[PDB]
Design a protein around this ligand. Structure first.
Ligand SMILES: C[C@H](C[C@@H](C[C@H](C[C@@H](C[C@@H](CCN1CCCC1=O)N1CCCC1=O)N1CCCC1=O)N1CCCC1=O)N1CCCC1=O)N1CCCC1=O
Ligand SMILES: C[C@H](C[C@@H](C[C@H](C[C@@H](C[C@@H](CCN1CCCC1=O)N1CCCC1=O)N1CCCC1=O)N1CCCC1=O)N1CCCC1=O)N1CCCC1=O
Ligand SMILES: C[C@H](C[C@@H](C[C@H](C[C@@H](C[C@@H](CCN1CCCC1=O)N1CCCC1=O)N1CCCC1=O)N1CCCC1=O)N1CCCC1=O)N1CCCC1=O
Ligand SMILES: C[C@H](C[C@@H](C[C@H](C[C@@H](C[C@@H](CCN1CCCC1=O)N1CCCC1=O)N1CCCC1=O)N1CCCC1=O)N1CCCC1=O)N1CCCC1=O
Ligand SMILES: O=C1NCCc2cccc(c2)OCCCCOc2cccc(c2)C2=NC(=O)C(O)C1=N2
Ligand SMILES: O=C1NCCc2cccc(c2)OCCCCOc2cccc(c2)C2=NC(=O)C(O)C1=N2
Ligand SMILES: O=C1NCCc2cccc(c2)OCCCCOc2cccc(c2)C2=NC(=O)C(O)C1=N2
Ligand SMILES: O=C1NCCc2cccc(c2)OCCCCOc2cccc(c2)C2=NC(=O)C(O)C1=N2
Ligand SMILES: [Mn+2]
Ligand SMILES: [Mn+2]
Ligand SMILES: [Mn+2]
Ligand SMILES: [Mn+2]
Ligand SMILES: [Mn+2]
Ligand SMILES: [Mn+2]
Ligand SMILES: [Mn+2]
Ligand SMILES: [Mn+2]
Lengths: 180, 180, 180, 180
């Protein structure tokens, strides 16, 4: 295919993130060489989920994103069967052992307002906490409970805007923006 | 022997846990290739003991389980001879430098209620703290003092239920359950 | 060139610091083999900046010094575009996610009093926090807010005086002092 | 020489401790192959000093023991010239950046009472904090200020008694005891 977006994704993100995103897309019938915008988004979503899990105390989070579908659901079942929390219909991204709730992390190129609306209406488990990040430095969380402290969330916002700058410097941002 | 339980234990637990469990069983005249249920249980008990020791503050715990019998008793003697705590008749699993007591960690396929009864009656040192975990997500500790915080114990419960699911998915749980 | 200062810098600082200082000087048209005093100063400034970033809590600081000019400004733009802080005219050394301000770290062979005066007058962004260290063990910070706790700053002062002793023992301090 | 004490020291302590003790003894005209009791004591003293430095918060301690005489005094001079603390006449073992004092750590086979007396009378700098450990599990510190918390000191006491047991099991304790 020879996409410019593909070579930028491989130099922007670390090899473990790229490998997990490639495996995730292929598992769902998506090709990272063609759907290069989806390739960038899944890497971005993966890195955001991992910085998020690094922001709290040790042992605080259980990472669901980044596993295969079967093993991700297996850990969800164990979390539900040991904490009594209701089983979510869709795969979440983390579990907060402190607040005892699942977290769905979103990363959007639109307003954080409209994307949360889509995710809140998509998921039926109203117990699942939602936390949205934008590429412009905005965020929005369920009940205005942002889970982490200010500095951990600020790192994610800074990293997101750096990716945007790197994309625009290569004339790839406009195609990435009008693709969500 | 060629046991399905053997190959699952080697892929479920990390190689250091398997090696320590193999050495522990052989030291007591048990063969991991035949007593494959005991092989799974000792690996599970070993991993639970190590996650437990990782749950507290640094330097808080002294790990007794996972050593050879002679060296495990040597550290117990040093702990007793330096803290004044009475020497337990049976080998415990950890020592809590914070609460100044030995901890016996149990992992059961039955009710956490009955297993503690067996361990409390087995040990005569009533000073030794007892902490039981089940594969269903229940726990029970001496004086209702669970030592660690909620999230460290929840990780162990989640991990235990994941092992149960992995066993049942391979049709090995029923033999493991009716073997304790 | 065969400078004694060059061989001391390579044995005093760790190879990653030397490599970053060499790249920084060459990027600005300076040669570490000739401008050996500048070579020592940039290594010292780099090490001080990194010990500083290690002094606070995790995630607290964003390191700007030690990057290439383009990437350093790219992260600054993301920090400004996500926190609303005004863009500084000159490249700072760190960003404090806790106090929400940029930090300019200085290391001087003169009085900490006069060097801050030069840096305060050089920078127009009065929001940028200034923190000066001397080779004699003195420090001076904006609004007397020294950011870190006492022990993290004391380590830097101790390290600075050790470098001075190592220089004087090799008869290189006097040339280094009367060069700033 | 072929000493039993020599081979036990090499299997009891980690190779970095043995190497530092060997270098320390040779620097003072002592041979680890002959003065095997001194070899064991210097390894024990070195390990105790390092567990001690690991007991406090990060950045809290500056390790003086384990360096060459010239570099150990160079760091002492920098600590004194930056904190204003008086220069000790004899090399201490650590510096407490929290309490702003040097620490002399002793390890004795006699009563902690008599050994402190020798060290307090040896050193003239009454500012230098003294902390003694015994192989029986006793300790004694200046002004009853034990610096670290209870659990960090208990680890050192446990480790000391384990070394004693390992020595006595090899019939080397009695020669080690009546050698101090
Ligand atoms: C647990 C293991 C893999 C972990 C990986 C995950 C990502 C981590 C990457 C590493 C490198 N670090 C750590 C330091 C910085 C860094 O870059 N971080 C964290 C920051 C951003 C990032 O990228 N983390 C988090 C805890 C430590 C670790 O490694 N993952 C993958 C998905 C689920 C999971 O837990 N797994 C998973 C199963 C098999 C296996 O072995
Ligand atoms: C101290 C050393 C071995 C330790 C091993 C023990 C287990 C540890 C495994 C490691 C890998 N980690 C650490 C990060 C995650 C991981 O997986 N963890 C901890 C979590 C689950 C697990 O498996 N821990 C705990 C402290 C660090 C360490 O390594 N053990 C073995 C028995 C006694 C003991 O202290 N020993 C022992 C004597 C010789 C030697 O060298
Ligand atoms: C993040 C990475 C490189 C980091 C390097 C920076 C310096 C660090 C050196 C290491 C070795 N440690 C860590 C333990 C002690 C030590 O000596 N420390 C810290 C103490 C003094 C020192 O020297 N730190 C700090 C966080 C961990 C780390 O490694 N840098 C370089 C400039 C910007 C930056 O963040 N980078 C940068 C981009 C590409 C890449 O991979
Ligand atoms: C700083 C460096 C060497 C340090 C070594 C010192 C000992 C450390 C040994 C290591 C292995 N760890 C760390 C984890 C457990 C372990 O076993 N620990 C600490 C516990 C017991 C032990 O043995 N520490 C302490 C901080 C980290 C470290 O490594 N030393 C040597 C003397 C002075 C000093 O600071 N030095 C010194 C100058 C050149 C160089 O590179
Ligand atoms: O967890 C998730 N799993 C999805 C795995 C996946 C990978 C590749 C293709 C695909 C599914 O099909 C897309 C189905 C229609 C959904 O449209 C999108 C588009 C882009 C991102 C997301 C969803 C998304 N955002 C998140 O925040 C997530 O957590 C999350 N997906
Ligand atoms: O510490 C322990 N050391 C035992 C070492 C050992 C290994 C292999 C065989 C064996 C002994 O013989 C069994 C003797 C009869 C005891 O029956 C069992 C069966 C299964 C687990 C345990 C005990 C057990 N549960 C714990 O919780 C422990 O801590 C613990 N053992
Ligand atoms: O961030 C910085 N970037 C400068 C990068 C650089 C490297 C090599 C040569 C050069 C610039 O040209 C010098 C231009 C005139 C400035 O004179 C000096 C001399 C010595 C140190 C500094 C400035 C300095 N002190 C700091 O504290 C800094 O943070 C800092 N520089
Ligand atoms: O720091 C120290 N540096 C000494 C370096 C050294 C190594 C080998 C031989 C030697 C000196 O000559 C001995 C001179 C007479 C002193 O007798 C002893 C005997 C055994 C231990 C100590 C002192 C001692 N105890 C501590 O606690 C220390 O801190 C400490 N030494
Ligand atoms: Mn997801
Ligand atoms: Mn998500
Ligand atoms: Mn046990
Ligand atoms: Mn047990
Ligand atoms: Mn700078
Ligand atoms: Mn600077
Ligand atoms: Mn000493
Ligand atoms: Mn000493």
């Amino acid at each position: 295919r020879g996409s410019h977006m593909e070579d930028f994704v491989r130099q922007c993100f670390n090899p473990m993130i790229v490998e997990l995103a490639e495996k995730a897309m292929k598992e769902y019938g998506e090709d990272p060489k063609i759907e290069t915008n989806k390739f960038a988004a899944t890497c971005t979503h993966l890195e955001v989920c991992f910085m998020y899990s690094d922001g709290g105390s040790k042992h605080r989070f259980e990472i669901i994103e980044g596993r295969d579908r079967i093993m991700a659901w297996t850990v969800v079942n164990s979390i539900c069967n040991t904490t009594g929390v209701e089983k979510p219909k869709f795969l979440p991204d983390l579990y907060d052992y402190k607040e005892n709730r699942f977290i769905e992390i979103g990363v959007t190129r639109r307003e954080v307002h409209i994307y949360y609306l889509e995710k809140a209406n998509k998921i039926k488990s109203e117990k699942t906490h939602i936390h949205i990040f934008s590429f412009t430095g905005e965020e929005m969380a369920t009940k205005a409970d942002y889970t982490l402290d200010e500095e951990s969330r600020a790192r994610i916002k800074t990293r997101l805007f750096t990716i945007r700058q790197e994309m625009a410097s290569r004339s790839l941002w406009d195609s990435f923006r009008q693709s969500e």
